[PDB]
């Protein structure tokens, strides 16, 4: 059984009002996409619009204004690179594509934008759906409730992996993604549930794809801010991977590469 | 489903026994003692005789020099943390026991000292019996091949249940721990699989106890060296845990008390 896909995140946020122009922002992306290759990262994604907690939606022009110098400028310096890019919209995911990335992840599981799909299916490449508790990539993160969240979850992503189907992408070139965190729930029970349960997605015939990456839900009793859940991202990411995770999605590359090489062991037998 | 109890390492072992300093200072060892309490180690586990790689053997009397001075120091300044000892010296756990230890944790499983089980059954403290691949502690790190590790190991520890019990320790006081890399083979396989199939020593009717703590089969692909074996140990460590580890034992509390604390929270049902 293999080695889990490492997915490491490239996030291009301009927030820092000072007097360097956007070239700054893509030098510090380059550093940042060497420094993750460095950690052993197989992927680079580039994600140009944030949809962590209390984020906010930008114009596809301020997302391709931002990833695409990031994209040239990696696929130029670091062509060995293989590029994802984090979008629900298919004007960017098609200029990324033409640029050379070979993954899309749509948070939206191809519902924010009906043309996504097509834009996938003309390529060759994959596409990552993944489970959202809402159509909207930016809802608020409502303590939303569930009966029995594996089954919600089973029953929307083979609904979206039809239609993505249906739109001409085939079978082998689809990735799913259960959601974790407040994509699922403010409460922290149905992400651990997810992640107990994981293996009962491989029924999906797909790969699987992981993002605990010190989201909410890894807050634990001493309700822990992003910064101190490193810990609880390598225990998640680790049992993600031992329960059928094929990709995982991190900040953290060398210390999430190293615990989930630690999980795949532990799945080999003699 | 109860939390793993946090067993943290606090070694006196002195840095050149020979060349250098015949002890630790005591009150180092007590600062140390400290951070691990407010780390949220539950146990601290005082250590006179290290058994890693290329560790030495030390008389009872040595022993003794070194870790009565501490335990009379921890007693003094924190009478309110869980003391346990690791020894296999029947005189050495008698007078631990004395100080107030309420654990003696054996990496021979008493067979090292054959004074060791009556000692404890005269006490109220608990008994860790560890699986080694030889009873002297300080064996080489031999290559030893299995057919079937879990099946040995399994049947091991359920014959030192029985001697144990045969010397009048009551089963609710036993805790067994498979052993972890080189007391088990420095083929990692090996330590690997005791992990994937921990569940399994459930049957034997005992608390659970490991150790991955930077041991040499968390040396991966990289051969990373102890200092490059956090991840991995948390992540070994959270596994256990999600197969059913009781204690976990560990010199980096914080990190892997707050890993070990997803694992718990993906073991709870609904
Ligand atoms: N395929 C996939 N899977 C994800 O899990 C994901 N997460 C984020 C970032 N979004 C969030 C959402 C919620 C939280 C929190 O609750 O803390 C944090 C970050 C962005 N792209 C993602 N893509
Ligand atoms: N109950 C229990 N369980 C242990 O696993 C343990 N380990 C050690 C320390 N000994 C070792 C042995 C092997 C290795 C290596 O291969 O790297 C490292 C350290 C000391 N007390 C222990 N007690």
Known sequence: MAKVKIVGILNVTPNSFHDGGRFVETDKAVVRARELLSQGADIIEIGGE?????????????????????????????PDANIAVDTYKAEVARKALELGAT???????????????????????????????????????????????????????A???????????????????????????????????????????????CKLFL???????????????????????????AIAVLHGADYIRTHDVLEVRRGCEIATAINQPP
């Open 50 to 78: 944030s949809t962590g907690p209390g984020s906010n939606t930008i114009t596809a022009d301020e997302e391709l204004a931002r990833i695409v110098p990031v994209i040239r400028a990696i696929r130029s310096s670091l």
């Open 103 to 157: 993954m899309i992840n749509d948070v939206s599981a191809g519902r924010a934008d009906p043309k996504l799909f097509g834009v996938v299916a003309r390529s060759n490449a994959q596409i990552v759906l993944m489970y959202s508790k809402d159509t909207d990539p930016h809802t608020s993160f409502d303590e939303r409730q569930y009966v029995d969240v594996v089954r919600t979850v089973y029953d929307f992503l």
């Open 159 to 205: 609904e979206r992996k039809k239609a993505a189907m249906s739109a001409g992408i085939p079978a082998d070139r689809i990735i799913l993604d259960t959601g974790l965190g407040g994509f699922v729930s403010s409460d922290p029970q149905y992400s651990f549930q997810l992640l107990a349960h994981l293996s009962d997605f491989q029924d999906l015939g």
């Open 211 to 237: 993002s605990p990456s010190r989201k909410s839900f890894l807050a634990g009793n001493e309700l822990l801010k992003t910064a101190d859940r490193l810990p609880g991202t390598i225990a998640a990411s």
